[PDB]
UniProtKB/Swiss-Prot annotation:
It holds the Pfam family FliW. The keyword Protease does not apply. Keywords: Bacterial flagellum biogenesis, Chaperone, Cytoplasm, Translation regulation. Belongs to the FliW family. One of its GO terms (cellular component) is cytoplasm. The gene is fliW. Its main location: cytoplasm. Monomer. One copy interacts with the each alpha-helical wing of the CsrA homodimer, yielding a FliW-CsrA(2)-FliW complex. Comparison with a CsrA-mRNA structure (2JPP) suggests CsrA cannot bind both mRNA and FliW at the same time. Interacts with flagellin. InterPro entries: Flagellar_assembly_factor_FliW, Flagellar_assmbl_FliW_dom_sf. This is Flagellar assembly factor FliW. Changing residue 122 to D: Loss of interaction with CsrA. GO terms for biological process: bacterial-type flagellum assembly; regulation of translation.
């Protein structure tokens, strides 16, 4: 099938490309089908198959946040059929700034995918030190 996208133009996608988010994503419960499209960069677009403008910029968190450590709740593990960490790909969503060096990531709400089962969820971590905005880069502007 063919879809429109935010960053890639019109593309052809296969059924086996689709990751199903059975609960949608927070704010958009009706958005249950996404494809992951590499920004030809360490960046991947979480692209809705139904709504072209709904395309989020993702990174794999450890590339910028090497100590990122989360503990998924039992309900999420069941919903995504996760048996161990080998089943899982993790991503965090960026809030892209201009200039890019001011970009932040939401470490509180990672995207969690069981890759081989093609199932996804955005998990909101409630028990943790992580916040909605963590800079990807150290501060450059001088400060007292």
């Amino acid at each position: 099938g063919k879809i429109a996208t935010k960053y890639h133009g019109d593309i052809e996608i296969h059924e086996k490309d689709i990751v199903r988010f059975e609960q949608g994503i927070p704010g958009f419960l009706e958005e249950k089908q996404f494809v992951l499209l590499q920004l030809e960069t360490p960046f991947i677009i979480l692209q809705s198959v139904n709504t072209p403008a709904l395309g989020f910029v993702l990174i794999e968190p450890f590339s910028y946040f090497p100590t990122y450590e989360i503990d998924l709740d039992d309900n999420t593990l069941e919903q995504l059929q996760i048996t161990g960490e080998q089943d899982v790909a993790l991503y965090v969503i960026l809030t892209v700034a201009d200039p890019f060096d001011d970009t932040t990531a939401n470490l509180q709400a990672p995207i969690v995918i069981n890759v081989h089962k093609r199932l996804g969820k955005q998990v909101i971590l409630t028990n943790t030190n992580y916040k909605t905005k963590h800079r990807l880069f150290p501060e450059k502007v001088a400060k007292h």
